[PDB]
Structures are given as structure tokens and as C-alpha cells.
Amino acid sequence: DSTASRYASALADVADVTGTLEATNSDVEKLIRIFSEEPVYYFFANPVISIDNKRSVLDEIITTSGLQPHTANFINILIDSERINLVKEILNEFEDVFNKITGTEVAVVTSVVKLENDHLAQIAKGVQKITGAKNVRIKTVIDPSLVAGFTIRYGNEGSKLVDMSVKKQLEEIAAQLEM
Amino acid sequence: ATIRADEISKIIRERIEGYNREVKVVNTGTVLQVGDGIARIHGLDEVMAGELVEFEEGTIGIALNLESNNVG
Amino acid sequence: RADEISKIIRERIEGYNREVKVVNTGTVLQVGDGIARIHGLDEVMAGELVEFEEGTIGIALNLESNNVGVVLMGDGLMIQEGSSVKATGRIAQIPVSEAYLGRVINALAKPIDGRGEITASESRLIESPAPGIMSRRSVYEPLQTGLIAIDAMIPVGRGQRELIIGDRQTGKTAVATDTILNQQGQNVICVYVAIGQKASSVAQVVTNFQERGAMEYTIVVAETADSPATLQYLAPYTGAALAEYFMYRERHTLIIYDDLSKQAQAYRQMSLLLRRPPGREAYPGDVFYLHSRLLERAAKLSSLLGEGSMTALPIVETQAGDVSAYIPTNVISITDGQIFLSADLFNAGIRPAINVGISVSRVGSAAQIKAMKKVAGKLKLELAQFAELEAFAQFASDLDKATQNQLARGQRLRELLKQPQSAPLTVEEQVMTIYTGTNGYLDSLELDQVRKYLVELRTYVKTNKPEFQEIISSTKTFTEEAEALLKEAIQEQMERFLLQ
Amino acid sequence: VSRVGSAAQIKAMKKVAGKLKLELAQFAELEAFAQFASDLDKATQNQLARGQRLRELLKQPQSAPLTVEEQV
Amino acid sequence: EKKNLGRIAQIIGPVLDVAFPPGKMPNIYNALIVKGRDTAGQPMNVTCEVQQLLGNNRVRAVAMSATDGLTRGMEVIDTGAPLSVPVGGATLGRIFNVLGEPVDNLGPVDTRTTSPIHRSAPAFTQLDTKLSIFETGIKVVDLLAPYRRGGKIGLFGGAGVGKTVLIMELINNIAKAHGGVSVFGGVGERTREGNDLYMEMKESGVINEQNIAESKVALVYGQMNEPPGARMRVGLTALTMAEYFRDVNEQDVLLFIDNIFRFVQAGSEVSALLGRMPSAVGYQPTLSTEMGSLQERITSTKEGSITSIQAVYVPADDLTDPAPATTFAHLDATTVLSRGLAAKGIYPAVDPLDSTSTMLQPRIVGEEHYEIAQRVKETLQRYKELQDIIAILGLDELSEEDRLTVARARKIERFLSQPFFVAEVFTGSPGKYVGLAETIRGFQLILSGELDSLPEQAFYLVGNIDEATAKAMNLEMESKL
Amino acid sequence: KKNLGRIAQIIGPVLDVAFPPGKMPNIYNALIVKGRDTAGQPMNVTCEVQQLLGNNRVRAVAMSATDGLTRGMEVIDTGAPLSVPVGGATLGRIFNVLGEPVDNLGPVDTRTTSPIHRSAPAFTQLDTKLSIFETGIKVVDLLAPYRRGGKIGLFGGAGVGKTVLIMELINNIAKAHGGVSVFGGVGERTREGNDLYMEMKESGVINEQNIAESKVALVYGQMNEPPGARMRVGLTALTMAEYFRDVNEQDVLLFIDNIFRFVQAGSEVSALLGRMPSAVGYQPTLSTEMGSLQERITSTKEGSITSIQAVYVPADDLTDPAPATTFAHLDATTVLSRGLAAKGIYPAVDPLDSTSTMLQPRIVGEEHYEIAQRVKETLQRYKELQDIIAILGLDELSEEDRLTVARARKIERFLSQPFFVAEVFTGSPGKYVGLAETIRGFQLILSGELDSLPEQAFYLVGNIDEATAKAMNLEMESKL
Amino acid sequence: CANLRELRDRIG
Ligand SMILES: Nc1ncnc2c1ncn2[C@@H]1O[C@H](COP(=O)(O)OP(=O)(O)OP(=O)(O)O)[C@@H](O)[C@H]1O
Numbered sequence A: 001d002s003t004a005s006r007y008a009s010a011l012a013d014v015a016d017v018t019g020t021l022e023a024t025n026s027d028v029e030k031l032i033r034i035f036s037e038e039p040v041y042y043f044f045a046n047p048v049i050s051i052d053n054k055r056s057v058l059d060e061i062i063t064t065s066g067l068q069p070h071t072a073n074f075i076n077i078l079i080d081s082e083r084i085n086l087v088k089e090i091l092n093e094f095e096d097v098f099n100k101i102t103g104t105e106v107a108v109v110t111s112v113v114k115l116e117n118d119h120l121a122q123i124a125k126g127v128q129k130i131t132g133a134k135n136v137r138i139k140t141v142i143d144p145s146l147v148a149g150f151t152i153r154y155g156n157e158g159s160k161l162v163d164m165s166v167k168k169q170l171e172e173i174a175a176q177l178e179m
Numbered sequence B: 001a002t003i004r005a006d007e008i009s010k011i012i013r014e015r016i017e018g019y020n021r022e023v024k025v026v027n028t029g030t031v032l033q034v035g036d037g038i039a040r041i042h043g044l045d046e047v048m049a050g051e052l053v054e055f056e057e058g059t060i061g062i063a064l065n066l067e068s069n070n071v072g
Numbered sequence C: 001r002a003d004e005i006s007k008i009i010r011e012r013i014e015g016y017n018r019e020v021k022v023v024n025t026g027t028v029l030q031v032g033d034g035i036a037r038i039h040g041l042d043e044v045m046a047g048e049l050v051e052f053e054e055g056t057i058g059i060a061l062n063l064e065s066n067n068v069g070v071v072l073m074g075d076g077l078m079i080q081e082g083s084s085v086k087a088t089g090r091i092a093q094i095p096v097s098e099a100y101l102g103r104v105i106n107a108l109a110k111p112i113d114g115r116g117e118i119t120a121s122e123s124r125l126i127e128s129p130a131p132g133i134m135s136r137r138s139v140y141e142p143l144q145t146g147l148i149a150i151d152a153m154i155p156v157g158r159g160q161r162e163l164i165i166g167d168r169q170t171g172k173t174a175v176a177t178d179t180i181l182n183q184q185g186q187n188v189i190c191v192y193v194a195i196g197q198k199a200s201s202v203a204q205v206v207t208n209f210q211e212r213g214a215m216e217y218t219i220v221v222a223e224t225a226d227s228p229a230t231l232q233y234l235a236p237y238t239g240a241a242l243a244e245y246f247m248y249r250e251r252h253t254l255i256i257y258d259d260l261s262k263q264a265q266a267y268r269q270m271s272l273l274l275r276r277p278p279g280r281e282a283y284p285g286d287v288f289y290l291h292s293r294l295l296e297r298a299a300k301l302s303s304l305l306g307e308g309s310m311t312a313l314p315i316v317e318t319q320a321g322d323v324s325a326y327i328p329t330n331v332i333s334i335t336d337g338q339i340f341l342s343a344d345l346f347n348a349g350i351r352p353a354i355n356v357g358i359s360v361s362r363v364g365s366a367a368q369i370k371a372m373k374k375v376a377g378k379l380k381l382e383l384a385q386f387a388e389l390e391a392f393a394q395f396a397s398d399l400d401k402a403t404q405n406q407l408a409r410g411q412r413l414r415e416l417l418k419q420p421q422s423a424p425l426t427v428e429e430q431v432m433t434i435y436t437g438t439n440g441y442l443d444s445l446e447l448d449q450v451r452k453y454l455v456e457l458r459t460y461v462k463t464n465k466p467e468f469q470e471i472i473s474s475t476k477t478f479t480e481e482a483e484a485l486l487k488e489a490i491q492e493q494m495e496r497f498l499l500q
Numbered sequence D: 001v002s003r004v005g006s007a008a009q010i011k012a013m014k015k016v017a018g019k020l021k022l023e024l025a026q027f028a029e030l031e032a033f034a035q036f037a038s039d040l041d042k043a044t045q046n047q048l049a050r051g052q053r054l055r056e057l058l059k060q061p062q063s064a065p066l067t068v069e070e071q072v
Numbered sequence E: 001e002k003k004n005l006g007r008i009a010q011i012i013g014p015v016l017d018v019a020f021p022p023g024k025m026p027n028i029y030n031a032l033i034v035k036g037r038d039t040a041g042q043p044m045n046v047t048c049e050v051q052q053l054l055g056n057n058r059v060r061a062v063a064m065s066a067t068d069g070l071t072r073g074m075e076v077i078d079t080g081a082p083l084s085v086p087v088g089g090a091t092l093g094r095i096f097n098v099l100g101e102p103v104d105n106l107g108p109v110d111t112r113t114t115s116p117i118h119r120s121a122p123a124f125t126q127l128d129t130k131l132s133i134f135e136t137g138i139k140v141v142d143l144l145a146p147y148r149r150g151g152k153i154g155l156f157g158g159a160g161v162g163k164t165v166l167i168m169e170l171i172n173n174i175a176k177a178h179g180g181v182s183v184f185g186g187v188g189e190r191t192r193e194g195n196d197l198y199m200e201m202k203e204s205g206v207i208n209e210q211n212i213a214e215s216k217v218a219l220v221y222g223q224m225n226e227p228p229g230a231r232m233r234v235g236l237t238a239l240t241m242a243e244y245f246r247d248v249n250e251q252d253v254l255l256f257i258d259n260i261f262r263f264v265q266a267g268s269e270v271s272a273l274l275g276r277m278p279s280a281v282g283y284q285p286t287l288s289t290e291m292g293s294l295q296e297r298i299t300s301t302k303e304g305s306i307t308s309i310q311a312v313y314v315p316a317d318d319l320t321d322p323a324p325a326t327t328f329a330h331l332d333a334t335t336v337l338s339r340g341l342a343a344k345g346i347y348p349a350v351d352p353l354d355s356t357s358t359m360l361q362p363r364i365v366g367e368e369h370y371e372i373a374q375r376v377k378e379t380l381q382r383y384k385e386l387q388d389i390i391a392i393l394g395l396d397e398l399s400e401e402d403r404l405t406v407a408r409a410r411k412i413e414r415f416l417s418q419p420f421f422v423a424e425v426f427t428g429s430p431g432k433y434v435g436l437a438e439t440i441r442g443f444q445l446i447l448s449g450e451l452d453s454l455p456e457q458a459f460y461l462v463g464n465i466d467e468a469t470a471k472a473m474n475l476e477m478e479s480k481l
Numbered sequence F: 001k002k003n004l005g006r007i008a009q010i011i012g013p014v015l016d017v018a019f020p021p022g023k024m025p026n027i028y029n030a031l032i033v034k035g036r037d038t039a040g041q042p043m044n045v046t047c048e049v050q051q052l053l054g055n056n057r058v059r060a061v062a063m064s065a066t067d068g069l070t071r072g073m074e075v076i077d078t079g080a081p082l083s084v085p086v087g088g089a090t091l092g093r094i095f096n097v098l099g100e101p102v103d104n105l106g107p108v109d110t111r112t113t114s115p116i117h118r119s120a121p122a123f124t125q126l127d128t129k130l131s132i133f134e135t136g137i138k139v140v141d142l143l144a145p146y147r148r149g150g151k152i153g154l155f156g157g158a159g160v161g162k163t164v165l166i167m168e169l170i171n172n173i174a175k176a177h178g179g180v181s182v183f184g185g186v187g188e189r190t191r192e193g194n195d196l197y198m199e200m201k202e203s204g205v206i207n208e209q210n211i212a213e214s215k216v217a218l219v220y221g222q223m224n225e226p227p228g229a230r231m232r233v234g235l236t237a238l239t240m241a242e243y244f245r246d247v248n249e250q251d252v253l254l255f256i257d258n259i260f261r262f263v264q265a266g267s268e269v270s271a272l273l274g275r276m277p278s279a280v281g282y283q284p285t286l287s288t289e290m291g292s293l294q295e296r297i298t299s300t301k302e303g304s305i306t307s308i309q310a311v312y313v314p315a316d317d318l319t320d321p322a323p324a325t326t327f328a329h330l331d332a333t334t335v336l337s338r339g340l341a342a343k344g345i346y347p348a349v350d351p352l353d354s355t356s357t358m359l360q361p362r363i364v365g366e367e368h369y370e371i372a373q374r375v376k377e378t379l380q381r382y383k384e385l386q387d388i389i390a391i392l393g394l395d396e397l398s399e400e401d402r403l404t405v406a407r408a409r410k411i412e413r414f415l416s417q418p419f420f421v422a423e424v425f426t427g428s429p430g431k432y433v434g435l436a437e438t439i440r441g442f443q444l445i446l447s448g449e450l451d452s453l454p455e456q457a458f459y460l461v462g463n464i465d466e467a468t469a470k471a472m473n474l475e476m477e478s479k480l
Numbered sequence G: 001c002a003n004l005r006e007l008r009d010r011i012g
């Protein structure tokens, strides 16, 4: 694994052993939305700033957004150790680890136009059957690359890919060369 | 170190249950990364540099080089 | 036909219908000047060559946790750090067929000569398990290397992986070409892979084969210098996959690699780029494993597998004429013997420059035919005695007549050994030559004229006593009729040579 | 070696002894080769004498300035 | 042991880093098979052992077969114990790879009993005291350079010198005279030479193709095709397959571990693969420890001796570099097979002069044995000296106080040549086993001065000295005709 | 283009620049850095992308000095792989690796610019006509003939030759060759570049009056340039030569001096770049980079790029990777030895080590091949008797072998040459001697017909007739 | 190798 994945797995194990899992995931989404917007990330980095000031402003930004107590201790430990400069990647891989532990698996469907909810739920049935995940989450992205249908980027991270799309004519012309 | 020996998920769970909470571990430590004859133990803050630490099986170890978290 | 050519397109257009398969597809983190540390490929077998969005196929060797580090089989300038790279179910295979005979190829088994495009429905995986010990057999029949030095004192039987190792520029490529050029009457499909050699030298070798007519049966797998690291790595395995097919289909073969030091240098390149820990000489962890994996798949199969035989003949270029370095000692531990081409013996006029000493052959006289088994024994013994008496070469001052005669015969025997460039000595000639030299029949001549006398003798014999051809080609034992015929021919030729 | 050659000397120096580098470096070979000798002719017996008298005159006691004529 | 399913996280070349659940973890050297899937469509399983732990439940393991085709995430299964080698009377005759599966395709081997590879050392109380001479059955070895039972032995000579007929003689003579069996342990053996040796065995009666479990060899062939973790562990596989024989049948076992420098080479390969920082000239840092773990289980336990015979190949011909240094720190008898002697035809080609043994000392061999051995070595020294001068002066011109020395030197150099129970397939001579007492008395009679009249070719290829007198008396009978 | 860069880190000559995610340059893509100078605002330092680190930043080596660059400086990617101006305008000017004029004349035109890092020529089109070449040197026209339209290597120790030989070879051939010559000062010392520029403009090659007429087109990435520059000035010379061989259809003669700099600068950048170190200290991709230079030099049915790279053997480590990889590419290699220079035999070309694949008899002429074989054998016999001579005395060997020793001395001194450009080192004028004349000289030398002349009469002599005259001069000076 | 090669030459 990576260090970010290790910290994310720690936070996910906490969200397991304490019954605050979905609240923890929502709080991590809030926290990564926070630790975007470069000024605050640069503030929590740049170790010349005193650790006391850093943890005090951390306490304030916790009591502002009202995070879960345990994830507040998590980001506080991240500040305590010198591995706070990884916090964006950690909160990013938390989605991976949370979904893997909870049993949900992400399926990215890319279609030329917005995909309707009924057929999206049918694609969810398909991805759920081929993978074996409980509450498969389909985050769709409208892309102009294709021509007619959809690509499914389900799997660990992008790895598996099934598609009825511009890849059809692509394979057609490519194996039409056949040289 | 980016991959620090004090970064096992179980180990950081022990620290993340309490950040600035109840008094730390005195003499009990879980061995990790017991590889090239050099076991990196987490905890053991009371270890004198050069201690004679014992293990579960009964294999004695000298605690020569003990870092900020891992008493190697 | 002006639209029938486009009508032909409709065939494949209606043919391909694209069922929905799973393509392992991940993003490219890092393009590392030959390596592309792509990310996200989870279910990719170690060795599946991937294809990018720009058609730059590359193999996936270094499968780390969060980034599969692939190496590019092409000039990877077009990768865009984000172009989703797809995997292929191929495990780095190449198509193989009989129609590769004569067309030089690269490591992709794509023809580089350009005079055609070889068709093939059978494909042998480039890396493959070598013959097991249930299938491998001991070496029976010899591979006539055309040289008296490497077919009398040190043989090379079919199935034995000898080693043409020597100093820089001593004749390793020329001796390997002499072997491939002799191997004409026989049925061996001689695959000559050239790793890292310049384009001009590969052109010179292929045009030499085409001039001599031995290019009908020779796949010169050619890897130019600017060819990427992966192809110079993969070329021996490509030629091995061709010769393994030709062997498994009952045909004896002869795969002659070129510069295994350069092959290991290309592996050093791709590994050190892929960040794999280096051992001695900065060569990576598995060099010995590597050279064995492509070099131990060369042996005689058994009767129930098809009697075929892949007889490797590597060329390990060692610098300053030593075996202490990593690659020469590794390939010497792998190969059944070796021959040492020494630059000193090369500049001293002995061409081929085959060191008569330490260049042992593990098989020994089990490979040689009965004629060689009888004559080359005395040849090896007399060359050993002449090398012992090489210290008395000039200081033999009216010494004992045993010493003087033995030293003179040895001095003549080494000019039996030396022979012209790309001159193939078919066994029917070299047996009579080694006989004439080892039985004193040319002790009368000086050191200079042995070459002219022997060329004239071989011509006269092969033109005027064709029963020797029947005996040596068919019976393959130096029996009484052949012996007496050779003696009489030597006498007549010596007489007319004195008449000049 | 000198990569500028006698192009960076006065005309007098290049005229009197410009071939001196190669002549002397050649005499070094004839000296090391005629240390061991048998039946030396007059060519060698006088050439080694010339080379000896040509080596022997570079023995400058340090911090003693030699004007250019004192070398010519 | 358990369904310890993990994922094969990182596969760098042969080394494959596997992860494990945080509960159960295989310790070091605990073999694990991965439920792999080959490109062909069959579920072939390449076996591995944990060479190193990397902490975060990921045990860095090296593979005993090619890793070409191992997806990450494949089910890796722990065995809970080191590589189970199918020891027993069953593994007497067949060829084996490192994991213990017969590759000679004859049939399956009884895995009813199996011992782990990495069993630890014997103990101080279990080691035996008396430095006991090991009667080989070669007159040269038994006289000049004796072998230590429970010790180590180096065959410096390469192939082509007659090493294969020598080791075949040693195995057949172990099965004939002694009560034990041998275990050829070819480590990194070039497969052509492997099949050469196997066919030489099958045609020399050493192993019976018609009768297995009656044969006298346990072939363990780690071919150089196999990854570095394999041909490294082939030595230890042969070692445990012989240690079962030792500590279960109380019989003298012979390990013919092929040239140790390949084992040390494989150790260097696997350590450079694991990334552990290399030591001196380039062998692994744990070179002394690893080669000592291979060659310390070669000890004469109270149950029985397990004496080995280990070829050693010095790279660039120096005793100085660590691998031959750490090996010669262990060897107890070093016998070189000489190429010129082999070409002469003084089979066995073992050189009488340059071969030496630490057992030769009188308190170990016997005072008379030490005296006669030192006198034979001095005589052969005298002959190696006078080989220069008998060319110039002749055998007659030189003094007749050492003409006796040259004559007895020819007699010794010939009498050392012994016909073998294996050379019967080649030449037709029956083959004579020569006890230590018989060769001692024979050399005492040759060197003392009685047999100064027998011809020189009467000692060539003969067994006991009375048989040499019989040869000479037959030559005397035929002299008239 | 327009894709601003914002250079993140500057670790020595290697600077990596954090592009936006969508708009990232490819590998080997020129990056002109709009950066400040030491005094004043405008300055354009060039960089080529070496690898894409994947944190939206790409590692680029610097073609100008890395001093004066700010973390955060704007930089655009050109999108063109470091184009170099070639054509009729490149004739006569000394060029940077960047593709600029260094001779302070009027700037070149950008009408016919060409990419510098292009693909190799395919084996389908390779012209292989084996024709010997007469350079002018006795030894390396006889003992190791050169292949016209083929690579040639002047290997040697530090200062044994290989630049005075390059100067004499250009002084000989650059007039004869109708096609232009493209000299590349790859990491050569600047003062020797100055000497070569002056010698070209004085020898009528540059023709300073009509600069557009010259039969030479120099590029200098000389010794005092950042390791990026020496990494690619060889490719600049190759791009000019490849243009003159692809379009102008004329056979060109590129001299690269110290091609070992093209590998050592690669080492100094590869260390910082993140690539792991190889053997004795060079880059990992030593062989592939060296091939990427050497393979583009091939006669390709449109012309013939004959080339003479003055390879530098690092301290005469003839087994080092940098010459060990170039021996495979170099056809008519020529190993110059400090051993045969310490005794003053110049040129310091080794008679034995210097070998060529144009010494095949049907290619070079039968009598010439036989004379070359006899000379090499006599020198090999001398090198084998060097141990007996040095220790046991000259007398302790045979009296035929003594004739072979004296003959080897005569030969190895006769293959000395007074160069026209080495007159400042010798003090004596230079004698250009053809091929047939040196063959006719060696025939009489090693045929035993003239074994009476003194050894010094064969030293530094143009032809055998001049040696005969010097014998008379020396015999008169002996008694006089 | 300029150190090892010189010693190989001297040993030869
Ligand atoms: N029998 C022979 N007669 C004449 N010349 C020979 C003979 N054998 C070899 N040569 C010489 O050998 C040279 C070529 O040898 P080779 O190509 O093997 O050298 P190399 O550079 O080591 O090869 P490579 O380029 O594969 O390293 C030619 O110049 C040729 O003159």
C-alpha cells in the first residue's frame, strides 16, 4: 500500500469499530472540500507556522463545520506527526477504502449525453452482478469523446472497462487496416 | 521516512482511538516488521537504550537503536 | 478494381462486430524515458504487453502495488501522461511459420527487410518453459562448424550450447557466420539473431548470406542500435521462439545469438530504469536467470517428441580478454563449454583465433563422428604437446630428434588450423586435412607452404577421388579403403606439387 | 604533452630546439632498450651519449630565474 | 495449514510481494503456493517461500517457478510450514525439482512422510566425537587424501575429467560396501548435463529403471531454468531428503551437492532481487550464514553419518574471494581431478599431489597410514621434479639411488588407478573395491622395496596388490609366448 | 505554443516544471524559459523535456546556464522537438546546440529548420557499398583502412592523438569531398575549436569572404557548456548531416570530436534526473543513447555520411562502458595508445588494436591485405617478445627472431607521419603520403631488402625514399 | 581497465 492508503484504512477501521460510518464518509467529503482551496492546505503545510497555532485553527475549523469527533482526532494526528503534507491524497483514498470496506464499488459510466435514472439503475444491476458489491455507486460523467452509448469504468480504479461507444468504429477501422 | 515503521493500520488505530487522551503504553508493545533479525517494536517508551527486551516465543533482544516511535 | 479495392474493405467491415469484453485500462502516471509507470491496471498478468492510445505497445514487467511499471517497445514520445492505456490478453507472443525463411525481422517478428510480409497462423510464446529432463537427450550428432579448430580439438554437437567468447574484434561474428555458411548441405535452420549490432553490420551479414546462397534457411533477427531497450532485450527470445518451433517440428536448428553482453546491457537498461535493485557490475537481480531462460531451451529432444535439436551458439563479447566479469562468467556457467577467440592469436596470423587451450568443450569426443573420433584424438594430443613445447619454439638448438620432429609437426599443425575468411570446410575435406597434418605426411614442406599444399590437395582429392565422398558422407568411419585412397591421393598431389 | 605546441614559443626557441620533445621522448625508448645490450654499434653508442647529454642539462635549482637566452 | 488468502501485491520479476490479512501471517521460510492461472487456461500453481517480511502484513516472497502470468490479487495460500519435501524410501531413484514433484514423469512419490526443508541444526550432544575415516573405495582417496564421514569434500575438477564416473563409483560403492544410500543434489545443474548424468546412472546400474525403491540415488535436479529462489533451495531440498535417510535409517548418506558456487550465486541473485545491500565482491551479505546453514547440517549425528561431496568452482581461480573462502572454511578434504591425468588415462583422474585433507594427520588416520601417505606424496613430488630431467638425462644416466624412486613412482602412479564398478559399461573390466587396509599394505609393499621387479604396467588398473602380483605372474606366463 | 509552465524545482542543470494537467508537452520537447538574466529582464534559456514525472511536472535538462532561474518562472513549450536551422544557410557558421550563430555574423534564416531528435532510418533503405578510403596517413590507410560512407573511430587515451589526427584528416579530406563536412565540437575544449575555426578559414574551407560558399558547417557545444548542451550538440551535428544526406543528396563528412562527452553529459544529467546509476558511473541508458546518436549515421541511398568520431577512452580504460558500447557501432575503429606515444612514435595509433572491417582482401586489394597481415603479425611478435627483451636482454633470443625484432622496430617507426597540422609540435614540415606509396615502402621494409638503415632513419618520415635520404643524411652527420 | 588490465598484462 501507500502511506495515504494506510491512514485512510485507519480512519475506515475507526468508522467501522465506532458506529458512525456514513457520517464519517460525509465528513471526509466535507474535509476534502475544505483541504482543497490552496490557502488552507498551504497553511496546514509549511511547517514554519507554529504547531499550537495550527492545531488551534484546526479546533476552530472542526467546531465550525461540526465534524465527527474521531475524524477530528485523525486530522489532528496528521498535524501532530509530520505527515500532514499528504492530507489531500489521504482524504482522496478514503473514498476507495471506505467503499471497499462498506462493500460499495464505484462504477464510472461515461456517455455522450445524460443517462436516465432507470437505465442507470439497470447498469447498476449489471455492475453489481459482475463485481459483487452491495450498493454500487454510479457517478456519471457526460463526455463528448464517444459517439452513441456508454463506457463502464467499474473496478478497483478504472481497471475493468466495458463499452459500446466510439471504440466500436475504432476497432472497426483499426482491424480494417489489418497489416 | 514516507513509509515509516510506525504506519501499520492497526498501530495507527491505537493512536487514533485517543489523540491527546489517557496515559500512553508503558511496557507493552506489538512487534512489527520482524525481518532481518531486527524487530521494530512499537511503544516501549520506558526502554533504556540497550534494554534486554523479551518476545512471545522467548527470544531475547537487545534494544540498540530506538527511534521516535519504533524501538528497533 | 478502382472501387473493388474498397469493396474488399466491406468484408472485414461487416465481419468485425465487437462483443463486449473487459479491457484492463488504467491511466499513465509517469513516462520515464523508456518506461511508462502506468497506474490502475489491477488484473494484468506479469508480462501482458499493453497498448497505449498511440499504438506504442509495451510489456508490463515491474508490477508494483500502485503503479504497474511497463517498458515501451517503441519510441514512446507520444504518450501524454493521462492517455488511458489498455491491456491486451497477449503474453508477449510472436507468430511463427515456415515462411520466415530468409527474411530479416525485428523482435516484434515484423519483417524489416520489407520484401514481403510473412503469414503465420501458429504462434509460439516468446518466453516458454525449456525442454524438461524427461524430453531432453544426450548429444549424438555433430554440428559441422566448418572450422578445423572448433571441429577437431573442441567439437560442437547438435544440441550442445557452445560459447563463442573472446576479446573485442577477434572474429566471433565471422566464426558464427562461417558456421552458418557451412551449414548448407545439412538441414539445419540457422537462426542468427543480432542484438545491438549496428545496421550496417547486419546489412553486411545478410548480404553475405544472400551472396553465398545460405540465406534460404536463415532468419536473421536484427536489432539495430536505436531500436529501444525492450527489443534488444527480447531479440534472443524471439529467435528462440522461431527456432523452438522449427525444432519441435523435427528439424535440427542452430540459433546463433550475437552479443549476449549487449543483451544483458539492454536488460540492465530496462531494469535500472524500472528501478530494480542492481547486483554485481550494476547488472540487475536476475541476469543469470535471464540468460539461462533463453539459453537452456537449446538441446536435443527425445524420440517421442520429434528428434529435433536447437543448438545454440551464443557470442559473449568480453573486454580485455577475461572471464572474470559478470556476464562472461555467468554465461560460461550456463553454457556447455566455450571457445576463446584471443586477440593475440588473432593478430599473430592464426585465423580463426581459437585458443587451443582453456577453450574446453564439455561434450568431448562424444559429438564427433568416427573419422574425427580417430584423427582428432591425435590432433588434440599433438597440439597439447606442441603447446607444451611452445617454450622451445625458437630455442630448439639441434635438440633431441623426438623434440625437433614433434615441434616441427606442431608448427605445421597450427597452419593446418588457420584457414581463410568465410571458407567452409565440409567434413569430407577437413578429415583428410587433419589426417595429412597429424600423420607427418606434410613434414617435408616448410611452415609457409602448408596452406597452399593443403588447398591444392583438397581440390585434387575432391575432383579426382569421389569415392572418398561416398565413404565419409555415408559410412562416416575412416575405414581401410578411405585410408588407402587418401594416402595414394596425398602421394600423387605431393608429387605434382613438387612439380609445381 | 603540450596541446599548443611550439606555436607558443619564441622564433629562436622553435628554431634551435623545437624537435626536442620528440627527439628526447624517442631517446627515452632507445635508452630503456639499450640498457641491456650486445654488439652495440657506433650509432647507438653515440646516440645514447647525445641523449644523455641532452637530458642532463635540465636540472634547475628552484627559485632561480633563467632569462630566455639562458635557455636558448 | 490455513486458507490464508492474500493478494500478490507487488511482482518484481521473480520476487512477488504478497499481502496478508492482519490476523494470520506466514513466518520466514514458511512456504506458500499461489493459486495461479497460466496463459494456457490451466490453474498451475507456482510455489513460493517467504524470504523476508516487510511489516505492513506484506511478506516478500521469492518464487520457485516463472512469475510470467501472475496477476496481482491472486489467491496465495499458506502451508504453515516450510516446503514439504516428500522424503522417505519412496524418493530413491526418481528425479526431483525443488518443490518435490518428480519431473522424470515416471510416477507420483509417496508423500505419506515429509520433512520440512529448513529444519534447524543438530545439537552439540548429538554431534559425534571421533574423527572417523570414511572408506570410499578409491585407492587414491583412501590412501592420500581420506574423506571425513560427517565431514565435507571438495571435487575441484571440472566436467570432462571423469567427475561423473567418479561420483557413480562412489555411489555404487556406498550401496555395495557400506549400508547406506547416496543423494545426488545437483544445484543449478545444466539440464543437458543433468540428463547426461541420469542416463549414465540408468545404464550403470546405479539406479534401476525396472526397479525403483531398490535404487541407490535420490536425484534432486534444480535446473538453471528455474528462478533464483529455486536453485538456491535445491541444495537444502537434497539436504533434508538425505537427512531423513540419516536420522530414520541410521545409515551413511552421501550428498553430491553440485558446485557450491552455483548455490552461492543463487543466493547472490535472490539477495540482489530482495534489494538487501550487497556485501563484498557481490555475493549476498548473509553469505557466511547461508552457506553455513547449507553445510552445517552435514554432520555425523549419533544416528548416522551424512557426509557430503561438494564440487567447488572458484571464479577467476582464487581462494581469496569470499565464496570460495567461506566454502574452504568448511571443507574437510579437497581432492582435485586433473585434466592432464584424465587424458593420460589414470582413471580416477584425482591428482595425488595437489589433493589434500585435514584428516590425513596421524592421530586421525593411524601412524602407519600417515607415514606411508607422506612417503607416497614425497615420492610423487620427486617424480614431478624429475619429469623435467628424465627427458634430458634418461632413466639410466641419473643416480640409481633415485632410479628406484622413479621406478616406484611409476608403480605408485599406476597403482593409484583403480577399475570401477561403473566403468564396466565402457571397457569391460569387472571392477574392484579396495579397502583401506589393503591399499595401505599394498603401498607399503610397493614403496618399501619388495616389488621392484614387477613391470610397470602390472599395477595399472588393478585392485589389491596381490591381484597386481597375479597380473605380473600372468604377464610372466605369456612372456615366453 | 501558449502552455505556461511555472518551473517548480531547479536542482542543478536539471529543472522540472509543473505544467497544467490538460496541456502537457511530450518527451524531447523544447521549453524556452522566459526568464530573467543576471542584468536585465529578457533572456531565453532552452530546455528539452526528458521525462514526465506525473505530478503535472516534467523534468527538463537546461541548454543554457541554470543560474538565474526562479522557482515559479513562466515557461512555454514550443511543441517542436528543439528545431535546428539547416539548409544553405548553415554553411560557414559556428552553431550552438540551441541552433543559433556563435560567430557574431548575421543571423541564419529559419526557412528550413529541422527537428533534432528524430527516428532512426529504417533498415529497408540502407546503402552498403564497401569502398576503401585514402585519408593520407600511412598507418591508418594501410594497417586499418577506412570505410567511405561509414563510421570511423579515433579511440585513444587523454591526449594521445584523436584531435591532431582529426585536424589533419579534415585538412586532407574537406577539400577533396565535394559534399560539405559538418564538424561537431561535442564537449571539446574551446581553444582547439578556435584553432580549427582559424585553420578552416585559412585553408579556404570556410572562405570568410563568401560565407555562403563554405564546404563546412560547424556546431560547438564545447567543453564549457551545461550538461544539457553537450548532451545534444552531437544531435545538432547529426541533424545538419542528416539534412545534407536526406535532401541535398550529397555525401557529407561529419567529424564529431570527443563523442565520449555525449555520454558523460548524459551521466551528469541522469544522476540528477532520477534514473538509477549504472556501472562505473555512467547513465543507465548509455547504450541506447549512444545508439541513438551513432545509428543515424548511415549511407542511406541518397548519399553517404562518412564520419570520424574521436571517441575518448576514459584514462585508457578500453573496457569502460563508454568505449565498449561505441566499439559495436564503429566500423573502422582506430585505438590510439599512450604506450606508443610515450616513446614518441606519432601518430600514437596502435598497429595491433586499430583494426577495420575494410581489411578484407576482396575489398581492400590482395597485396595490400597481405602487407597489412604481415605488418600486424610482425608487430604482434614484437609485443610478445617485449617481455623477453625487457628482462633477459636483447641478445637472449634467436637470430631470426632478432631480425623480426629489428624489422618490427623499423615498421613501427616507419608508420610515423609528419602531419601538416602537427608541424608546430614536430618542428619539421609535413609529408602527405598516399596508400600505394606506403604499401611499396612496407614491402621493401619487411622483405628484408633494406635491413641496414639505422632505426632513426625510419622515424617521422613521409615515404621510403625520404627514409633512404635520411639514412644518407644521418651517416654523413655521424662522421661530421 | 587501466589498473586491472595493467596487472593482467604483467601477470601474463
Ligand atoms: N578466417 C579469417 N580470415 C581473415 N579475416 C578474418 C577471419 N576470421 C575473422 N576475420 C576478421 O574478423 C573481423 C570481423 O570479426 P567480428 O565481426 O567477429 O569482430 P567483432 O567486432 O568482435 O564482431 P561483433 O561486431 O559481433 O562484436 C574481420 O575484420 C575479419 O578481417
Ligand SMILES: Nc1ncnc2c1ncn2[C@@H]1O[C@H](COP(=O)(O)OP(=O)(O)O)[C@@H](O)[C@H]1O
Residues within 6 Å of the ligand: D001, D002, D003, D004, D005, D022, F157, F158, F159, F160, F161, F162, F163, F164, F346, F347, F348, F417, F418, F419, F422, F425, F426
Ligand atoms: N604527429 C605529432 N607530432 C608531435 N606531437 C604530437 C603528434 N600528434 C600528437 N602529438 C601530441 O599529442 C597530443 C595529442 O593531441 P590532443 O589534442 O592532446 O588529444 P586530445 O584532444 O585527445 O587531448 C597533441 O597535443 C600533441 O602535443
